[PDB]
Chain A
Amino acid sequence: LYNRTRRISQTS
């Protein structure tokens, strides 16, 4: 089941 919530981008 794919979670369709908006995704956070991160560095390291």
Chain B
Amino acid sequence: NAVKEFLAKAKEDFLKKWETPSQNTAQLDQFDRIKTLGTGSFGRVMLVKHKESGNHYAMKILDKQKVVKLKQIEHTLNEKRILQAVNFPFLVKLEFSFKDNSNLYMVMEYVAGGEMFSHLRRIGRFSEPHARFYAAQIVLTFEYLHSLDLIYRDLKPENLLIDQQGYIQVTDFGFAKRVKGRTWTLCGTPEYLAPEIILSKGYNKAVDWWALGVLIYEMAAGYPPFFADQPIQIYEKIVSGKVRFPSHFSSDLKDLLRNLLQVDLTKRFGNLKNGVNDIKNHKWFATTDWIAIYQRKVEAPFIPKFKGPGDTSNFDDYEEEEIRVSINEKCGKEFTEF
């Protein structure tokens, strides 16, 4: 009941910012660029430092020409519109955004602990309690997003960052979409694709609960439930309706995962009459204090080593290219709304 009123409030806030988006709240020459943290097909994310405040931020840079050239104009306008509109303890905060002649820029709080992917691969697999601590934050986060009619559609350890308190910050709304009923776009990463996406059916927010099942499996095994050397072979396993579990998995974990990795949508946890409460009240989450997780009062199982402001030791090294800004504005028409 306290949940329904919190989410009613959250919907109002989201909708005001959605309707009247933040635009052009800084400029490139207010920041020093320090290091590339990540890359994508139309740009990069860089650690930057605000010259006046000395605060560090993660700055996502998108090349407008490459965005138009790869026909993802809507996808990027949309990514920024959602990010500027949401507010949740496990979502990375957008602080500033702007554009120039060549690029779009989204300046986020810097999450210094790096990607869950790194920690998970280094240690091999997480204990059930450790995996459960992270899983609860994703459950609350999808509860939040779904209540705004958002589907996230790109869950992966690679895009779940670990903050200085060892909690999750979800990054990258690149594939997120406001959807009232069904949508049809084929997007994600092969190992996280829900079967209804693979089969080109119209799908809903339940693809996110399937993806949660893949994440929990992968966090607890150290590898995902469906993998092969060719995507089509992964897709065959996903749609097959069969999953194998490591014998070290608890019986409660196997049960939860059989219910999330349900090919049949009439049977998938998160998609039934009781919604997210089927997941929250599952035995695997018996020991979980949902309010305490939301209030970030639970002690993290792990805190990344943090060697001072702007430490990037938890991040991989990428080639440092020049950020060329043209003397002439490009694609100005297409990105008016940004």
Report which B residues bind A (CB closer than 8 A).
Answer: 72, 75, 117, 121, 154, 156, 158-159, 174-175, 185-192, 223-224, 227, 229
State in angstroms the CA–CA spacing of A8 and B38 once bound together. Answer: 12
Q: Is the CB–CB distance between B117 and A9 below 8 Å?
A: no
Complex Cα–Cα for A8 and B192 (A):
11
Q: Per a CB cutoff under 8 Å, which of A2, A6, A8, A11 touches B186?
A: A11
Bound-state CA distance A7–B116 (Å) is: 13
In the bound assembly, the distance between CA atoms of A9 and B159 in angstroms comes to 10
Q: List the 4 closest A-B pairs by CB distance, nearest first.
A: A11-B187, A7-B189, A2-B223, A9-B189
Q: Do A9 and B154 have beta carbons less than 8 Å apart?
A: yes
The reply to whether B174 and A6 form a contact with Cβ atoms under 8 Å apart is: no
Report the minimum CB–CB distance from A5 to chain B (whole Å). Answer: 9
- Taken together as a complex, chains A and B put the C-alpha atoms of A12 and B174 apart, in Å, by 13
Tell me the interface secondary structure of chain A in the complex. loop
With contacts A2-B227, A3-B227 known, is A11 near B175, CB below 8 A? yes
- Decide if the interface of chain B is mainly helix, strand, loop or mixed: loop
Across chains A and B, the number of contacting residue pairs, with CB separation under 8 Å, is 36
Chain A nearest CB: distance from B7 CB in Å? 27
- Shortest Cβ distance from B187 into A: residue: A11
Size category of the binding interface on chain A:
10 to 19
The answer to whether A7 touches B156 (Cβ under 8 A) is yes
Chain A residues with CB below 8 A from B117, complex form: 6
- Residue positions of A touching B, CB distance < 8 A: 2-4, 6-12
Residues of A within 8 A of B189 (CB): 7-10
Chain A neighbourhood of B190, CB < 8 A:
7
- Asked if B158 and A11 sit within 8 Å, CB to CB, the answer is no
- A2: B residues at CB distance < 8 A: 223-224, 227
Q: Which residues of A contact B224 (CB under 8 A)?
A: 2
A3 to B224, CA, bound (A): 10
With a cutoff of 8 Å between Cβ atoms, the chain B residues found around residue A4 in the complex are 121, 223
Other-chain residue from B185, B192, B229 in contact with A11 (beta carbon distance below 8 A): B185
State the CA gap A6–B159 with chains docked (Å): 10
A3 to B145, CA, bound (A): 31
Q: Is the CB of B188 within 8 A of A9?
A: yes
Chain A residues lying within 8 Å of B72, measured Cβ to Cβ, are: 11
Shortest C-beta distance, B276 to chain A (Å), equals 24
Instruction: Considering the complex, give the chain A residue whose CB is closest to the CB of B188.
Output: A9
A9 to chain B, nearest CB (A): 5
B239 to chain A, nearest CB (A): 19
What distance in Å separates the Cβ of B8 from its nearest Cβ neighbour in chain A?
A: 32
Asked, given contacts A6-B117, A6-B158, whether A12 binds B185 with beta carbons under 8 Å apart, the answer is: yes
Asked whether, in the complex, the Cβ of A12 is within 8 Å of the Cβ of B158, the reply is no
A9 to B154, CA, bound (A): 7
Q: Which residues of B contact A9 (CB under 8 A)?
A: 154, 156, 159, 174-175, 187-189
Q: List 21 A-B contacts (CB under 8 A).
A: A2-B223, A4-B121, A4-B223, A6-B117, A6-B158, A7-B156, A7-B190, A7-B191, A8-B189, A9-B156, A9-B174, A9-B175, A9-B187, A9-B188, A9-B189, A10-B187, A10-B189, A11-B72, A11-B185, A12-B185, A12-B186
